[PDB]
Ligand binder design. Structure first.
Ligand SMILES: NC(=O)c1ccc[n+]([C@@H]2O[C@H](COP(=O)([O-])OP(=O)(O)OC[C@H]3O[C@@H](n4cnc5c(N)ncnc54)[C@H](OP(=O)(O)O)[C@@H]3O)[C@@H](O)[C@H]2O)c1
Ligand SMILES: NC(=O)c1ccc[n+]([C@@H]2O[C@H](COP(=O)([O-])OP(=O)(O)OC[C@H]3O[C@@H](n4cnc5c(N)ncnc54)[C@H](OP(=O)(O)O)[C@@H]3O)[C@@H](O)[C@H]2O)c1
Ligand SMILES: O=C(O)COCCOCCO
Ligand SMILES: O=C(O)COCCOCCO
Lengths: 364, 364
């Protein structure tokens, strides 16, 4: 029969990532703006089984290799929108820049109907890198800090390449992401579910390892599905074009309240913040747990994951010494994007979803 | 000619108040839900000139007097919606309760097409009175505190009288209100504009008198027009009926940032929070300034106001020792109300509006 017709064709670079995996779902929903969408999903690893059960055309490609990327993406003549939702896993400015340049150099000369490039960075734009920050609430008019942030390099490539080629652009700066991918290098919900699961397995309480300040302060986050919706909005709506845009759930929460919910969701005792205690390292608490995780996977018949891949304990340790990082959604709301989530409900939805996918044990 | 036709008829109780004055405007806009609206506006004082220039039918009535209230409101047979946006100016539970009972007892037996009662209370529901608070973000499922809050008494009357008479109800709990009325007993924007104006008049800097914590913490507020919109939404939309609902602008701000903007708006030097200083009383700083204000009114040809009526320095002193009071808008958003304001823009809009109305001097 005949070749299928699509209104829009997405290239999702980082399709196994915390946002890319949500784009793989949201782009294929019937009422999604710009649909019907065809989705090409790029990542470096072989396609996981969980993603092979989705109507996404997977392209295995190391996007840090220019020749390989040209070979794999230059045939894709029908792309209309690029969603760059990847990073190399370190803060190296040049390796990250190379990945994004390779996508653009392979696609721009070959996709005659290309319209738009979405670049995903983050709120680290406002306060620095992990290796003086702005005061908050963070707004998109704040200037770059004088530090070597790879986000700066990615933006500079975006502006140059889109300007030369009459393409529109958007920069998306999500808050901390609440999502479900077990292949992410920075997935807080999965990290905390894994910790809770190990505590439950060992008959131990859910002990909060963080700082006092992070227990009590206001924090914010963004559901991965909302980031997907926001990127799609900017890809399709002329009002959003050529803009830098924050993305968060629209509300605030406290880790104190999340912690209680996490313990309830796993049916275990909570030990909250104890007055006078200093933060301890969750990465250190978990450093010898690789074989315990392997045993838990086997006992619960989970999708097989390596502990350091499903969990990022180092990233929880950063979250638990952070404060004063709230970002503003006013610019997006003023431009007409009114999407939101209840963050407490979002956190629980992500636990539910990871259980459905068999990444984390069911409640017992 | 013929009697005019209206779709809805509002009784705004407290029409000179910080929210009632905004209802007097929003209800008469062409695209307001439930329109066209007829507006009866009730307050105790003689109608101010500023309000007489609006298409509102003013009813001067002391609503604490039952016989008087019956006499003045029982003839109003066409009322469809009540907006109770008043309080007596003290925390006395019985005088406040009497005012609201008198409205209901005068209207319910006489307005055959009455549909709905909107009751405005506030976030003090969650943390106590001015004479242990809940942790935040505050949500509408939080139980009453064991304290004598007149809000409890008002709610109890609302539920009883609406239930007996097959009426719908809503309870609105606004955050700190950003508005323009110079007749309010609690108008923070006007209070701070008056302080700034006195500082400017005396060739003094805009000295922040508050606490460290209130300078740096996250705070929230609500534009009076947004409270009006929210009350009207609940009055007209079946989804919102019989609900307790918070109302805020949807974002957060810091007083540190507001203070800089206030100084810029008045063209004067800012002295922000100074490390190590304790809060001082703005009420004490201003206690002898009544005649200075009279002179400023005369010199700038302002609408004549008494200092203690246009400004509430005591209320600024409470704002400047408050922290941890953020409220959630998730319930309203989940029920479909997506109204919002940028709080920094709202604050400036209120300064602009008070200058337009000649309550506060123009920029010079
Ligand atoms: N996660 C958060 O909470 C968060 C919050 C705010 C902002 N951000 C920012 O969002 C951006 C994207 O990160 P993310 O967290 O969404 O990523 P992520 O969940 O860690 O996913 C990374 C994705 O990039 C792919 N990738 C990495 N190296 C690749 C290569 N050489 N070739 C092809 N694919 C490659 C990965 O696939 P493979 O594993 O196969 O390589 C995976 O699909 C970053 O700038 C990050 O700082 C993240
Ligand atoms: N202002 C805020 O920032 C704020 C924030 C959150 C919640 N709230 C709550 O909102 C509710 C309403 O207060 P508000 O601040 O909107 O009020 P407001 O600005 O102080 O206005 C009070 C109104 O009530 C009228 N009033 C008072 N006593 C009256 C009487 N005996 N007879 C007739 N009218 C009378 C006043 O008219 P006259 O002067 O003529 O008497 C005025 O119109 C209160 O429960 C308050 O705590 C206020
Ligand atoms: O937003 C980004 O640029 C990366 O995520 C930062 C998370 O914020 C620190 C606490 O985890
Ligand atoms: O919300 C209410 O019930 C009354 O206003 C409270 C203002 O909050 C304290 C700091 O000003």
């Amino acid at each position: 029969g005949v070749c299928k017709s699509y209104k829009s064709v997405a290239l999702v670079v980082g399709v196994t990532g915390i946002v890319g995996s949500s784009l793989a779902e949201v782009l294929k929903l019937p009422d999604t703006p710009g649909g019907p969408w065809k989705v090409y999903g790029v990542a470096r690893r072989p396609c996981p089984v969980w993603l092979a059960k989705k109507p996404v055309e997977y392209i295995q490609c190391d996007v840090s290799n220019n020749q390989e990327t040209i070979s794999k993406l230059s045939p894709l003549k029908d792309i209309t929108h690029i969603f760059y939702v990847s990073w190399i896993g370190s803060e190296d400015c040049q390796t990250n820049a190379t990945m994004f340049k390779n996508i653009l150099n392979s696609v721009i000369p070959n996709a005659s109907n290309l319209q738009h490039v979405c670049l995903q960075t983050g709120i680290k734009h406002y306060f620095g890198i992990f290796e003086v920050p702005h005061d908050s609430p963070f707004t998109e008019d704040l200037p770059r800090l004088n530090v070597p942030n790879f986000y700066h390099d990615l933006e500079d490539i975006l502006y140059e390449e889109t300007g030369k080629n009459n393409l529109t652009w958007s920069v998306h700066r999500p808050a901390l992401v609440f999502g479900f991918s077990p292949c992410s290098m920075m997935n807080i919900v999965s990290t905390l579910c894994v910790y809770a699961t190990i505590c439950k397995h060992e008959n131990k309480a859910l002990v909060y390892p963080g700082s006092k300040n992070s227990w009590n302060c206001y924090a914010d986050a963004v559901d991965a599905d909302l980031v997907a919706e926001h990127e799609i909005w900017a890809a399709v709506d002329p009002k959003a074009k050529n803009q830098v845009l924050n993305c968060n759930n629209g509300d605030v929460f406290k880790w104190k309240h999340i912690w209680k919910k996490l313990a309830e969701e796993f049916g275990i005792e909570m030990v909250g913040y104890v007055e006078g205690k200093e933060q301890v390292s969750l990465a250190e608490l978990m450093k010898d747990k690789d074989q315990v995780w392997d045993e838990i996977v086997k006992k619960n018949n989970l999708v097989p994951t390596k502990l350091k891949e499903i969990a990022a304990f180092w990233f929880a340790d950063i979250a638990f010494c952070s404060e004063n990082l709230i970002s503003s959604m006013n610019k997006s709301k003023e431009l007409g994007f009114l999407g939101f989530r209840n963050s407490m409900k979002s956190f629980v939805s992500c636990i539910d979803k990871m259980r459905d996918y068999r990444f984390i044990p069911k409640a017992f």
